[PDB]
C-alpha cells in the first residue's frame, strides 16, 4: 500500500504524480530560475557599464593632463 | 519487464538506480554548481571593487579641483 508518499512534504516535487501537474511544475520553477538569471546578468551588466564609463573618463582626464607635455 | 530504462541516455540521472551511486552523483553535481556560483560571485566582486576604486578616485579628484574655490 502506497503510504510513504504521504510522508513527503506537500510542496516537494515528488508529491506530483504524473502528467499535467508535473508539466506545470516544471514550467513555473524553470521560469523562476530563468528569471533570477536574467536579473543577475542585468545587475552585473549595469556595474560593468559603470566601470567602463568611469574608466574611459580617467583615460580622457589623463590625456588632457598629458596634453600639457 | 523493465526495458524502457535502457532507452534513457547513459549520462542521465535517471539511469542511476538507488543508493550509493545516486549519493555520489548528487555530491559531484551539487559541488560543480556550488563551484560555478563561487566563481560568479568572485567575478562580480572584482568588478564591484574596481568600480568602487574608480569612483572614490573621482571624488578625490573633484575635491582637489573644488578645493580651488
Ligand atoms: Mg513545485
Ligand atoms: Mg551524473
Q: Which of A44, A48, A55 sits opposite B54 (nearest CB)?
A: A55
Burial A33-42 (b: 16+ CB within 10 A, else e): eeeeeeeeee
Q: Is B44 within 8 Å of A47 (Cβ atoms)?
A: yes
Chain A neighbors of B40, CB-CB under 8 A:
40
Give the torsion sign (CA, A15, A19, A20, A25). positive
Resolution (angstroms) stands at 1.9
Q: Measured between alpha carbons, how far is A60 from A42 in angstroms, rounded to an integer? A: 27
Asked if A8 and A14 count as a contact pair (C-beta separation under 8 A), the reply is: yes
Write down the residue that cell numbers 571624488 correspond to.
B59
Compute CA B20 distance to the chain's CA centroid, rounded to the nearest angstrom.
27
The 10 Å Cβ neighbour count of residue B47 is: 16
PDB experimental method: X-ray
Nearest CA in chain A to B54: A54
Which chain B positions have a beta carbon within 8 Å of A51's beta carbon? 47, 50-51, 54
Rounded CA-CA distance A20/A28 in Å is 12
> How far apart, in whole angstroms, are the C-alpha atoms of residue B44 and residue A48?
9
Amino acid at each position: 500500500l502506497e503510504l510513504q508518499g504521504l510522508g513527503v512534504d506537500v510542496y516537494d516535487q515528488d508529491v506530483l504524480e504524473q502528467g499535467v501537474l508535473q508539466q506545470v511544475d516544471n514550467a513555473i520553477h524553470e521560469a523562476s530560475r530563468a528569471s533570477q538569471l536574467v536579473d543577475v546578468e542585468k545587475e552585473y551588466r549595469s556595474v560593468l557599464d559603470d566601470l567602463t564609463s568611469c574608466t574611459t573618463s580617467l583615460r580622457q582626464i589623463n590625456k588632457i593632463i598629458e596634453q600639457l607635455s
